[PDB]
């Protein structure tokens, strides 16, 4: 789950006599593997349509890679989650070079700030925010200023020995 992957999953709802060639529903799923992806596919299709895994089939599952994995992108994520007392819709902005990176950051962020588990979260939408000043959140907007530069004060240097002889420094 540190590497989520994104999959398109197309499922069908199996052809009967009255309906040959059914409607081919497609989802984008964030999962660790294809097993979890097909599981989540049937989870969301049993919430949208009158279908279930026993009366349907999977016709395709493909891993979608990121088109530009080394371009920095601003993402808006619309998410629905369960709290301890209700269900809430939430919009967050996440800055990464990948959609699965944004979704991993979202899951860590939701577990951190809201104590929301994976079982309580629906990703409603991930969309790359195409233009600056459509960026709503000011924790993202601070990284879009011109000629941005900052230091990292108080550098803590990792020691591999138990004892040090020098009384180290946190210069940087």
């Amino acid at each position: 789950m540190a590497h989520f992957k994104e999959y398109q999953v197309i499922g069908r709802r199996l052809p009967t006599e009255s309906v040959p060639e059914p409607k081919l529903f497609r989802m984008r799923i964030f999962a660790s593997n294809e097993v979890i992806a097909k599981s989540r596919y049937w989870y969301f299709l049993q919430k949208l349509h009158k279908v279930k895994k026993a009366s349907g089939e999977i016709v395709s599952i493909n891993q979608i890679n990121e088109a530009h994995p080394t371009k920095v992108k601003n993402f808006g994520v619309w998410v629905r989650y369960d709290s301890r007392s209700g269900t809430h819709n939430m919009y967050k902005e996440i800055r990464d070079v990948s959609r699965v990176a944004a979704v991993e950051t979202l899951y860590q962020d939701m577990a951190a700030r809201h104590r929301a588990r994976f079982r309580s979260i629906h990703i409603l939408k991930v969309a790359e925010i195409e233009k600056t000043a459509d960026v709503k959140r000011q924790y993202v907007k601070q990284f879009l200023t011109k000629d941005l530069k900052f230091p990292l004060p108080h550098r803590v240097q990792k020691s591999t020995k138990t004892f040090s002889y020098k009384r180290p420094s946190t210069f940087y």
Binding site: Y139, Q142, F143, L148, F150
Partner: protein, 190 residues
């Protein structure tokens, strides 16, 4: 949120020299000199053009950003105190017993001593802190004027003189007797 960079301006007037070794600030203007240890904040001072000093916080949370404007106000108070000084004027409020405030020597330690506060036989004593000058006003009755470079010292010594004359065991909406700060300003201002 951890704001990336929050930064405050500090304006130095012409006759003032500010020396900031690590976070120990020394401000030297015409009235004298002042020093403040600021090693409890973790800010970063820098000098722009010998009349402007930036102070900045990097990757600082809400409380750490809140302390930065405090640091700017502390160094501005140092500059204002060594340029203009501070002058706090207190009034004696009494109904029947006239509060008798004199300044006295006890072993060279320079005390304000207060007699007849609400008819008390107890002499009260507030030590004048170093830097604070006590004088008594002419053509304004019942006014004691505390002056000095350090607003901390002048304000705390005026607060000592106010808290030493608080009323015990009486309704203090009716027994208003005390010494109160009436004016806060500067020594040399117009």
């Amino acid at each position: 949120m951890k704001y990336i960079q929050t930064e405050q301006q500090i304006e130095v007037p012409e006759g003032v020299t500010v020396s900031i070794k690590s976070r120990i600030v020394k401000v030297v203007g015409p009235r004298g000199t002042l020093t403040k240890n600021l090693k409890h904040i973790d800010v970063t001072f820098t000098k722009v053009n010998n009349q402007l000093i930036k102070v900045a916080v990097h990757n600082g949370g809400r409380k750490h950003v809140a302390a930065l404007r405090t640091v700017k106000s502390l160094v501005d108070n140092m500059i204002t105190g060594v340029t203009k000084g501070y002058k706090y004027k207190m009034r004696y409020v009494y109904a029947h017993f006239p509060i008798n405030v004199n300044i006295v020597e006890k072993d060279g330690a320079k005390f304000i001593e207060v007699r007849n506060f609400l008819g008390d036989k107890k002499i009260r004593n507030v030590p004048v802190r170093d830097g604070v000058t006590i004088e008594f006003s002419t053509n304004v009755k019942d006014e004691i004027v505390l002056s000095g470079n350090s607003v901390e010292d002048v304000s705390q010594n005026a607060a000592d003189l106010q808290q030493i004359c608080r009323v015990r065991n009486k309704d203090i909406r009716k027994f208003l007797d005390g010494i109160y700060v009436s004016h806060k300003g500067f020594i040399t201002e117009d």
